[PDB]
Amino acid sequence: NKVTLADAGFIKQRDLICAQKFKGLTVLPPLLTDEMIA
């Protein structure tokens, strides 16, 4: 709760900072989720 993530590679549905997807910048989610790192 002290590291604020930006995108985390999740699916996108007043405009947020994630409007870089429309210009071709897509963030991929990691293979190992946090439930597996835990």
Partner: protein
């Protein structure tokens, strides 16, 4: 200590040529830049896992 980084993917045929014009035909004569950039980004995404 930091362990991993975010994994970004760049679409060349939407960043340079903004997908509303027909300049993608002029991008095919520039060689293989966006093949090795996509390969380097894929290798970075593999190394981050």
């Amino acid at each position: 200590l930091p362990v991993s980084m975010t994994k970004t993917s760049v679409d060349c045929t939407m960043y340079i040529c903004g997908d509303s014009t027909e300049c993608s035909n002029l991008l095919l004569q520039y060689g293989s830049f966006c093949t090795q950039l996509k390969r380097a980004l894929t290798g970075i995404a593999v190394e981050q896992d």
